[PDB]
């Protein structure tokens, strides 16, 4: 599917200006497009098919080189940095293997209750072991390249959008509706702008929504 | 990839060859290719795509058939019965909805021989069966591993399969080991050219279950690995 490949163009059309605009530090460390060619390695590397809106994404920027994340301080990452870091969650995973806290899914078997997957490729870090990423081995419930987060603290895997696009949409409208301060032009976060609420962190405001949509279409069956 | 493609071309020719030798009944069972249009009207209402080795076994048998009886059909891998493409949308498109009914809901213990290398669930829309016992059960590729399994590993699973297993790395792998068997004479044609069923030749051993034969190696090799 082409799904969240419009989504994806669009994201980066509001990311890219909104950056010029608010943040042009944060705007210069956005780097130019992947080739196609450094796509084809990078998939023959890991094995893997890229979801065609991850593969417009990185036609667009190859991550972000410094470098302050530019998701409220999350990490866009560069595609070898992917490929470094599945590498890295690869070794975690047959380590696991090689000698055998819950790991869970929300919603419930969306996701595999387990701490690594080869086929789980990290798109985001928070440089701390969390990862925003694209799940390619969904659970009975999920969806093919849903993204999802996992990584060092995340016990409990929520999917947070159906495709890449849809994710990097739903952060661009945060920025279009004011869900942002900064703290140089200096450093990106969140806040509720309608409530005039706190500062949040990015993951847990993505848990939450997960959360609520969740339980809203819990009724409908 | 270039994975299982040859392996599923070696076997088939073994096959073809074996079934028209020992039992042209069987052998006349095995249905004409599938077209290319064939799979991709498939591969569009399942929203998957077939692994090569797969599709390359359907361009040169479409399941088998035997539309000439009123009895059932003897099954070409030791009588479980090699599914056409149709029978193959179909019945995943029925597991998909056991899988969407156990999601709708509030079944013992899933488990996966290797550990870890199948998801210890009921049902997943991305098992999909090509042979069936036509009682639940199914051999199949598994297009979304556990964390320990390979992407088109082939699985059983169904009714009777709480635990899952492994029995091979692709549906080349798969075929030729079944082609092996044929050709070490792992089989007798029981009759009333006869039903075929499964033997180990060389040890003399009594007429098994090709389920509890694959179930078995699997074990012995995950034990001889780990």
Redesign the interface.
Same mark, same amino acid.
Do not use: E, M
């Given at each position: 599917s082409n799904d969240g490949v419009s989504e994806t163009l669009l994201a980066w059309r509001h990311i890219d200006f909104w950056t010029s605009e608010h943040n042009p530090d944060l705007n210069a460390t956005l780097s130019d497009p992947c080739t196609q060619n450094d796509i084809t390695h990078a998939e023959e590397d890991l094995e893997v098919s890229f979801p065609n809106p991850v593969k417009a994404s990185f036609k667009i920027h190859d991550g972000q080189e410094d470098t302050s994340g530019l998701f409220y301080g999350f990490q866009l990452m560069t595609l070898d940095q992917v490929v470094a870091m599945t590498q890295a969650w690869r070794n975690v !995973?047959?380590n696991?293997?090689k000698r055998?806290p819950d790991q869970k899914s929300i919603p419930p078997?969306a996701v595999?209750p387990?701490y !690594?997957?080869? !086929?789980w490729i990290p798109l985001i870090t928070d440089n701390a072991g969390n990862h925003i990423g694209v799940d390619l !081995?969904?659970?009975?419930?999920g969806k093919?390249a849903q993204i999802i987060t996992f990584g060092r603290d995340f016990d409990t895997k929520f999917v947070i959008a159906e495709n890449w696009g849809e994710f990097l949409l739903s952060f661009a409208n945060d920025l279009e509706a004011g869900n942002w301060y900064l703290v140089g032009d200096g450093e990106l976060v969140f806040r509720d702008k309608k409530s005039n609420g706190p500062i949040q962190d990015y993951f847990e405001v993505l848990k939450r929504r997960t959360w609520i949509k969740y339980q809203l279409e819990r009724p409908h069956?």
């Open positions: !995973a047959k696991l293997n055998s078997n595999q387990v !690594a997957h080869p !086929a !081995a969904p659970g009975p419930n093919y069956r």
